[PDB]
Design a protein around this ligand. Structure first.
Ligand code: WZH
Ligand code: ZN
Length: 257
């Protein structure tokens, strides 16, 4: 079973997932002196229906908030896309201390956490399963989370975690629009990349927001107090789940700004 421990963690993933050492791996360090302003990039447009929010789940290495993805009620458009992308999930990554925890870095700076809002190409493909095997199948919005003031927009999410404390627990999570978590500016970087954990498929168009959102030290502690163990076992806190940055291998990061 893959994880983030020394034995099952990012450094070992290449043994069952050799794409780990591929040419389009994520995350990356965004060097602002090497980005290329692209005039053809349209603004990002999100239109999410809060009725598509379904369920929150403890998946052992992280937690996921899933959405109903049977129709186009909740869609991403614009940016580098011709196609509409259908929201299916959001989740976070964090680190063992405030010093690190983001997956993407900007000019070598590490943030405390990172929000991923994940979508699949419903213009071209008819399921997440089909879309995840395609170079153009997935679109993920990444938002860097900078330790500081408590973020009240996180409140429904953090309040839900006490019902999913241990691995495999799940609960209804309804009437939530995750566009409320995005920063006020949607200026972005984009590059072609991958899932940041197994199976590490090179199927993702990344959209990284230049503006951070806030999170308090105590809000991060709530993520780290989730348990990776099943109920009844010895408590094993979910201390971290961020992958180190990977080589660009000649990819261009483009800037909308
Ligand atoms: C043996 C095996 C089989 C299936 C899987 C598996 N498959 C999938 S494919 C569904 C998918 O699109 N996942 C996804 C999307 C985005 C990101 S991120 N962090 O934003 O880059 C991460 C994950 N997902 C897993 O979580 C998992 C998991 N776990 C892994 C291993
Ligand atoms: Zn992620």
């Amino acid at each position: 079973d893959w994880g983030y421990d020394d034995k099952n963690g990012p450094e070992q993933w290449s043994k069952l997932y050799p794409i780990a050492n591929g040419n389009n791996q994520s995350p990356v360090d965004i060097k602002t002196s090497e980005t290329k302003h692209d005039t053809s990039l349209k603004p990002i447009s999100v239109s999410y229906n809060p009725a598509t929010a379904k369920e929150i789940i403890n998946v052992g290495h992280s937690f996921h908030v899933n959405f109903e993805d049977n129709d186009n009620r909740s869609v991403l458009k614009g940016g580098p896309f011709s196609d509409s992308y259908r929201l299916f999930q959001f989740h976070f990554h964090w680190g063992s201390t405030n010093e690190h925890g983001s997956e993407h870095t900007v000019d070598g700076v590490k943030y405390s956490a990172e929000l991923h809002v994940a979508h699949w190409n419903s213009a071209k493909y008819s399921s997440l399963a089909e879309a995840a095997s395609k170079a153009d199948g997935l679109a993920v919005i990444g938002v860097l989370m900078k330790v500081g003031e408590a973020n009240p927009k996180l409140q429904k999410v953090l309040d839900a975690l006490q019902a999913i404390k241990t691995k495999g627990k799940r609960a209804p999570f309804t009437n939530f629009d995750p566009s409320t978590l995005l920063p006020s500016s949607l200026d972005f970087w984009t590059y072609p990349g991958s899932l940041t954990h197994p199976p590490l498929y090179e199927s993702v168009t990344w959209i990284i927001c230049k503006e951070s959102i806030s999170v308090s030290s105590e809000q991060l502690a709530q993520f780290r107090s989730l348990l990776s163990n099943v109920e009844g076992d010895n408590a094993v806190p979910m201390q971290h789940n961020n992958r180190p940055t990977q080589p660009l291998k000649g990819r261009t990061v483009r800037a909308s700004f």
